[PDB]
Amino acid sequence: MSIIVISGCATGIGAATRKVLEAAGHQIVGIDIRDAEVIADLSTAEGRKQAIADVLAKCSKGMDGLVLCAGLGPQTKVLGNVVSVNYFGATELMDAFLPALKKGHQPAAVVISSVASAHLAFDKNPLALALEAGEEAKARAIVEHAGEQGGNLAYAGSKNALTVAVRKRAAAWGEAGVRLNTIAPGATETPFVPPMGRRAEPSEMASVIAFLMSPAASYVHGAQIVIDGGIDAVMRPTQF
Template identity: 35%
Template structure:
């Protein structure tokens, strides 16, 4: 059965792989990205997020079967928080009414294996309890402290997204409306940004020492795309509120028995 999807971050990486896989399987896909997409917007801005909802409503005819919020940044800047958390949440919440009109609605987003690592507590508190302006203000403070500290914008934003999802998925608005809401947490994904580091045996060894992935090592974007497509397919009737690690075993190595 042909389904209608919206995928953010559809021009590259995991988003593009997800879009391509859905198209390959005969589904309709509305792609969202800064450029080279059906809807070209900047998800760091409120106007860009509003444009996604308005244009998606027009292009979909008012009904979506799946929403996959992939768009994100990993840069050591405050804009990372704006896209990774506020852009993803605005996309999912804003398109929920269109999903509610589907006979089999599904939604998913992308967290990260880094969500279980070091984070900035002040930023997390600002995201969860303050305004976006306050969160971005703290994010700018981290940014101005240099790349190493500024990088905390990334894992903190992904941790906040995972916590939001866990809290929202069982509610009346999502589970009560029959909409499974899940996330994936990828390990190292081979993209144009990471490929140079992985191109030499020395670089690969350095990466795998800091991020052990005993099962097959780093992956291409097709692997997480397959998982996103399954989570947002009709066959997923009961998986919800989950952050599914697709990380070659990193989570098991890092946390061991602590989750149980």
């Protein structure tokens, strides 16, 4: 009846989000390497193509929501996968799912970026043009040839490009009647109480996603919601 598609649903935020949205009465179609209705590794072009097809086959009448939580962190063995999953794993899926989203009830989507998205300027992001141009092989080569902290480049670079990608889609998605926002998590407890000085439980990310997926955020669109206990504000008080 009310379908919400969730990538990266097996663990962390994706899993916590699935739990919350399921309690809200939604039917979840998850995408992940395991424990998901759609088994897929989004690190390759073919893998996402198949994941997209498998999802749509289950959402012929459309979908009410989309939450893209799949992601890989810095210090991932093969840095090329960080770029593939973090960027294309999100961009290709949201772009292919928009038609189905347009047919849903109060359709909304949330993309999980990262506070890291702001540690680099898009115009000075070594991956920007390649990613924006869909040149996956090139983007993966950039980080695998970066050397020193190529991990941070791959992570912050993909996330920064991802947040911009989402923001540049605001006009089109708005026209389609589908809200699209990102959350930018800070330190999460992935293997109430004031936020400053502690990590967040994955559920604290999920509670914000639920809000962004609900009528309470009916006028929130194209925004990046930072969920980091205040760290970003201390670091960049004049930058927002």
